[PDB]
């Protein structure tokens, strides 16, 4: 219904930084839900793993949570007027090398369970070499 579009991956230097961007279209006309009504989660899938949580943001941005590994290093924000979610990743490390997806849940609140989200982006590669 709602589609998410990722962008911003690539190669970065150990200690460098990237800003992941997620742009949203359509709607769930059935529920009257749009990007701005829905919480957004950021998940990453490291090589050969499943897809763990990084951080999440409530519908109007009033609440966010982060996995401890990225706390103080990553920041999720959103501009509902531009239909976009941002993940700002600073002091990137080799351990953050993974593919990152944004996902939108049909709820005002976010979750850390991948199976609880309704629409995803295709995902973008992030590789940090030292």
């Amino acid at each position: 219904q709602v589609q998410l579009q990722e962008s911003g991956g690539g190669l970065v230097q150990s200690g460098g930084s990237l800003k992941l961007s997620c742009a949203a279209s359509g709607s769930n006309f059935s529920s009257g839900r749009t990007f701005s009504t829905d919480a957004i989660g950021w998940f990453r899938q490291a090589p050969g793993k499943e897809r763990e949580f990084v951080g999440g943001i409530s519908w109007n941005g009033g609440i966010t949570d982060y996995v401890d590994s990225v706390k103080g290093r990553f920041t999720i924000s959103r501009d509902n007027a531009k239909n976009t979610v941002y993940l700002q990743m600073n002091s990137l490390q080799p351990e953050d090398t993974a593919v990152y997806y944004c996902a939108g849940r049909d709820s005002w609140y976010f979750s850390k369970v991948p199976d609880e989200y309704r629409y995803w982006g295709q995902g973008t590669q992030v590789t940090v070499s030292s």
Binding site: S27, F29, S30, G32, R105, S107, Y109
Partner: protein, 499 residues
């Protein structure tokens, strides 16, 4: 019990309900484009409303032609509703659109067409010709919903009066008057009102929102005007004064649905009363199994702001809880900066309210009021919802060509979509104001005559499946008519959906 259901709610769990209520949108300057209508329709609009207190027949032909086209493009059945001007001392077209009056100011009040639009702080025009002959020096002239009040001081001329301004106010073009004395003997259909209705019958509108309906005999007047070219179009009485509320029972009986014009009511009755008046009118409409609409003041402040107020939202929620079949936006959608967002706020309010009501209680209530012996027709639709509940059905599929059946089946307020499979388009369109119904058109000319009623049932079941209602191994509830009945449906069938 709601009490149980309430303590079982979680704000965090997603809601699952397929929306049961219907959203009525008013068309106007910001939504009249085909692309805009298409956005209204995608965002949940079931009937487009043509407010005829404004615009020419050319503006309103543009709307008809444009929703039909937008509808077509979407392959949907959208209703068209002609809201009448109504009998209404009305007055405006101010010079520069406006004028402001201070207490103590003296202002002419003329029934001369010469100042009908060069209306200034000093001389303006009141549509009622009998004003000098019905309002005497001393009494008051309520201007713009009991807000600005004028004390009459003299019949200055043959058709002009010189009046004393009580309270300050800013009057914009076209403000309604509420002369506090009755015996104004106001007609049910002004001469324009008539002429606007042939134009509606002539263009094939699905329903009239007849305005300022006071007594049942007026709802007869509206009818007769519609003619026989329009015998089959819906009349929705607009209850907007104490007389409507007073005779709500014979107005309901003689109308086809009721609209609660909440704001218009609140000119004459207190807010705390209006609350009750809505509970009351809506519920009487439930019991009569007639469609009831909430009207004025819905998500008002989302006409200029990207979000409405929490109070306005518990307001819409209440109209749903109260039992409304539809909510109607006006100005939120007609002159507003966020039409698609407001309409999508309305969808989310309905689903959340729907999700929050016990599924059964309305059924039980409406059932426990029915007198016994029930009639066959009543029992058939009653037992349908009942069976559906009992076997856990995911959709009721009724075959009705006028749709009377779907309005009966919805009167028991099931907890699943009603899929109406009709051979009339008008019926598709008109059913838009009845809770839980979703019509599906069987073009007889295009296909067989479907006397075995088999194609039509497939039609309904195909839809139920593609619309996401029902899936392999779900039980469905078919309500049609036997080959040996005068009219009405008397046959019901409990099928299982096969892969």
């Amino acid at each position: 019990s709601q009490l149980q259901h309430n303590i079982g709610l979680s704000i965090f769990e997603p809601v699952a309900k397929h929306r049961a209520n219907r959203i009525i949108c008013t068309i106007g300057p910001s939504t009249q484009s085909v692309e805009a209508l298409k956005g209204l329709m995608k965002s949940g609009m079931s009937v487009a409303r043509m407010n005829f207190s404004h615009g020419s027949y050319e503006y309103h032909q543009t709307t008809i032609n444009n929703v039909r086209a937008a509808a077509a493009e979407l392959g949907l059945h959208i209703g068209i509703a002609l809201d009448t001007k109504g009998p209404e001392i009305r007055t405006g077209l101010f010079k520069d659109g406006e004028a402001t009056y201070a207490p103590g100011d003296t202002v002419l009040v003329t029934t001369d067409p010469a100042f009908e639009k060069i209306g200034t702080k000093e001389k303006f025009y009141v549509d009622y010709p009998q004003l000098p002959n019905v309002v005497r020096p001393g009494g008051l002239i309520y201007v713009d919903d009991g807000v600005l009040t004028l004390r009459v001081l003299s019949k200055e001329d043959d058709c002009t009066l010189k009046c004393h301004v009580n309270n300050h106010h800013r009057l914009t073009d076209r403000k309604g008057i509420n002369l506090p004395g009755c015996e104004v003997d106001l007609p049910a259909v002004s001469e324009k009102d008539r002429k606007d209705l042939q134009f509606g019958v002539e263009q094939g509108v699905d329903m009239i929102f007849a305005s300022f309906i006071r007594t049942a005999d007026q709802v007869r007047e509206v009818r007769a005007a519609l003619g026989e070219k329009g015998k089959d179009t819906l009349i929705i009485s607009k209850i907007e004064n104490h007389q409507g509320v007073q005779n709500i029972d014979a107005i309901i009986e003689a109308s086809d649905g009721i609209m609660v014009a909440r704001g218009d009511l609140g000119v004459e009755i207190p807010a705390e009363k209006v609350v009750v008046a809505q509970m009351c009118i809506i519920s009487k409409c439930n019991v009569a199994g007639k469609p009831v609409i909430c009207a004025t003041q819905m998500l008002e402040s989302m006409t200029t702001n990207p979000r409405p107020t929490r109070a306005e939202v518990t307001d819409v929620a209440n109209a749903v809880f109260n039992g409304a079949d539809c909510v109607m936006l006006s100005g939120e959608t007609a002159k507003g900066k966020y039409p698609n967002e407001v309409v999508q706020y309305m969808v989310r309010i309905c689903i959340e309210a729907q999700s929050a009501t016990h599924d059964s209680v309305m059924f039980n209530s409406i059932k426990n009021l029915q007198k016994i012996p029930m009639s066959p027709e009543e029992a058939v639709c009653s037992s349908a919802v009942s069976s559906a509940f009992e076997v856990q059905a995911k959709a009721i599929l009724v075959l009705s060509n006028t749709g009377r059946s779907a309005r009966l089946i919805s009167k028991y307020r099931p907890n699943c979509p009603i899929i109406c499979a009709t051979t009339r388009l008008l019926t598709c369109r008109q059913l838009n104001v009845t809770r839980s119904v979703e019509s599906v058109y069987y073009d007889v000319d295009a296909h067989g005559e479907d006397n075995d009623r088999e194609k039509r049932v497939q039609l309904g079941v195909d839809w139920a499946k593609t619309k996401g209602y029902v899936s392999a191994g779900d039980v469905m509830v078919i309500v049609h008519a036997d080959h040996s009945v005068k009219g009405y449906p008397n046959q019901t069938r409990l099928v299982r959906v096969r892969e």
